[PDB]
From a paper:
Pseudomonas species and other aerobic bacteria have a biotin-independent [name] that is crucial for their utilization of malonate as the sole carbon and energy source. MdcA, MdcC, [name], and [name] form the 140 kD MDC holoenzyme, with 1:1:1:1 stoichiometry among the four subunits. The malonyl-ACP is decarboxylated in the second step of the reaction to regenerate acetyl-ACP, which is catalyzed by [name] (30 kD) and [name] (28 kD).
We determined the crystal structure of the [name] [name]–[name] complex at 1.86 Å resolution by the selenomethionyl single-wavelength anomalous diffraction method. The two copies of the [name]–[name] complex in the asymmetric unit have essentially the same conformation, with overall rms distance of 0.4 Å between their equivalent Cα atoms. The structures of the [name] and [name] subunits have the crotonase fold, with a β–β–α motif that is repeated four times in its core (β–β–α superhelix). The two subunits are related by a rotation of 173° in this complex, suggesting pseudo two-fold symmetry between them. The A. calcoaceticus [name]–[name] complex was reported to be a 2:2 hetero-tetramer in solution, and the [name] subunit itself could also dimerize. In contrast, the [name] [name]–[name] complex is a 1:1 hetero-dimer in solution based on our gel filtration data, and a 2:2 hetero-tetramer was not observed in the crystal either. The structural overlay with the S. aureus CT indicates that the C-terminal helices (α8A and α8B) of [name] clash with the second copy of the S. aureus CT and therefore the [name]–[name] complex is incompatible with the CT hetero-tetramer, which may explain why Pseudomonas [name]–[name] is a 1:1 complex. In fact, this helix and the following residues are mostly disordered in the malonate complex and [name]–[name] alone.
Residue numbers in the entry:
A (entry chain B): 5 to 36, 57 to 198, 209 to 262
B (entry chain A): 6 to 179, 183 to 248, 254 to 268
């Protein structure tokens, strides 16, 4: 039990990750498609967890999977307006949308993004990107909205995947790993691939509450720095 | 340079960017039906400091630039009796693709734009997205898709999708227009998109590339009615698909 194979977070499927992070005995899966939505407690506090199964369709989002995430976030915001401090935790292993439902998937991402901003008037959303799929596409923009972004060494986070970059921008020009993101200030914590460590970081960040000056509110500063 | 630029000039009255803005951004304050509005458009800038963003893409400067321009309006109207409308004129080919863009966090820049637009909407600014051309992928998420109401021109050049036709062809090893045409959420045309229930209205125009006087009148009228329809009402996304509805009903039952 002290060995990596039994302590690893990335080795777990999405449903196992969700069960492992929520307080013992609180895990309750809704709508039991490729996304797990679960209710539970996080250190005794009401919580909802959406976890994308990257092993299925590469975690590509469609109409149903997209609505599951958006709807979970929407109900958490509703809870908070009713005085219930529900916290949302997003496990983002995804590469984009399903071509066959492309515009429904994209519309759902816009709804997910809207719900994150609404909810973060009350509670921070924590996003965990652990790999092995990592987080690409429209959902990386969602990650960029979240109060806190936690990554592992095996995580990648970015807008465009490797293949679409090379096909559009070329084999080379004249980056997305968890360590790099942390070093450039685009992720808030760099985590060992260890279940207990991931769980504790998640709880510490929720207990921290809403950040005073998150990255999204620093446009003038980013514009200055890019201007350099 | 683009349909977005053409329509910005027609609707706002000016062509040149503001002193403080990236040249790939057009921003102008004006009035519609006596109501304060701000027009925003992303447009091509061949002299973009970022080489991968020189053909109208939403890249680093465009994402953070939009965030800044929207937040500027939000802060200015904090005390005003009337929050100015944000009129997004949408004609964007894609997000920028590049290694410098990824290294410098283009996903975060576009998140900045989304966050500003959403906060403005939640605070009571009417947001209207006017689709006059391409509305693609992350560029559309950043510029337009947070609108209270979406209005599209009914024209073959107006396309909403998650990826380019070329990219889609590569992944399905292909011809793709033919395949995508039978699957509405997969289709690129605006009639298919409208069938999803995601547009408030569609509008035919005579000369889509440079609006006629009658076109300008029809579009201004429609924007006016969208504005009237939003004001005082709920501040949700316009889209607010039976499967989606079922999902939300089940979540509420089981919450």
């Amino acid at each position: 039990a002290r060995l990596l194979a039994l302590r690893s977070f990335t080795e777990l499927g999405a449903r196992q990750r969700a069960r492992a992070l929520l307080d013992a005995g609180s895990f309750r899966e809704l709508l039991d498609d490729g996304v797990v939505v679960a209710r539970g407690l996080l250190d005794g506090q009401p919580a909802v967890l959406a976890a994308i199964e990257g092993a299925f369709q590469g975690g590509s989002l469609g109409e149903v999977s997209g609505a599951k995430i958006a709807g979970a976030l929407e109900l958490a915001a509703e809870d908070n307006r009713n005085g219930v401090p529900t916290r949302a935790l997003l496990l983002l292993e995804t590469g984009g949308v399903r071509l066959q439902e492309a515009n429904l998937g994209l519309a759902a991402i816009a709804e997910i993004q809207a719900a994150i901003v609404d909810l973060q008037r009350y509670q921070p959303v924590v996003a965990v990107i652990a790999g092995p799929v990592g987080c690409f596409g429209g959902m990386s923009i969602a990650a960029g909205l979240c109060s806190y972004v936690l990554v592992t060494r095996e995580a990648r986070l970015g807008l465009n995947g490797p293949q679409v970059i090379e096909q559009e921008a070329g084999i080379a020009e004249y980056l997305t790993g968890g360590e790099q993101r942390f070093a450039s200030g685009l992720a808030d914590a760099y985590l060992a691939d260890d279940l207990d460590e991931v769980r504790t970081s998640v709880l510490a960040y929720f207990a921290k509450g809403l950040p005073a000056r998150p990255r999204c509110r620093r446009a003038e500063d980013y514009l200055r720095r890019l201007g350099d | 340079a683009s349909r977005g630029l053409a329509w910005f000039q027609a609707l706002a009255g000016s062509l040149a960017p503001r002193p403080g803005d990236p040249a790939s951004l057009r921003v102008a304050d004006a009035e519609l039906d006596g109501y304060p509005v701000r027009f925003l458009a992303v447009v091509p800038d061949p002299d973009n400091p970022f080489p991968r963003a020189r053909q109208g893409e939403v890249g680093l400067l465009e994402g953070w630039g939009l965030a800044a321009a929207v937040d500027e309006a939000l802060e200015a109207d904090r005390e005003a009796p009337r929050k100015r409308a944000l009129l997004a004129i949408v004609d964007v080919p894609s997000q920028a693709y590049g290694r410098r863009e990824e290294a410098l966090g283009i996903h975060q820049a576009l998140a900045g734009a989304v966050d500003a637009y959403a906060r403005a909407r939640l605070a009571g600014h009417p947001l209207i997205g006017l689709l006059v051309g391409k509305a693609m992928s992350g560029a559309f998420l950043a510029h337009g898709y947070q609108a209270n109401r979406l209005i599209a021109l009914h024209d073959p050049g107006v396309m909403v999708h998650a990826m380019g036709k070329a990219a889609a062809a590569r992944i399905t090893l292909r011809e793709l227009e033919a395949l995508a045409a039978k699957v509405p959420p997969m289709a690129y045309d605006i009639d298919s998109y409208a069938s999803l229930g995601l547009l408030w209205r569609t509008l035919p125009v005579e000369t889509v590339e440079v609006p006629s006087t009658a076109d300008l009148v029809r579009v201004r009228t429609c924007l006016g009615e969208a504005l009237a329809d939003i004001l005082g009402g709920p501040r949700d996304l316009g889209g607010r698909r039976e499967a989606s509805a079922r999902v939300r009903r089940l979540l509420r039952e089981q919450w």
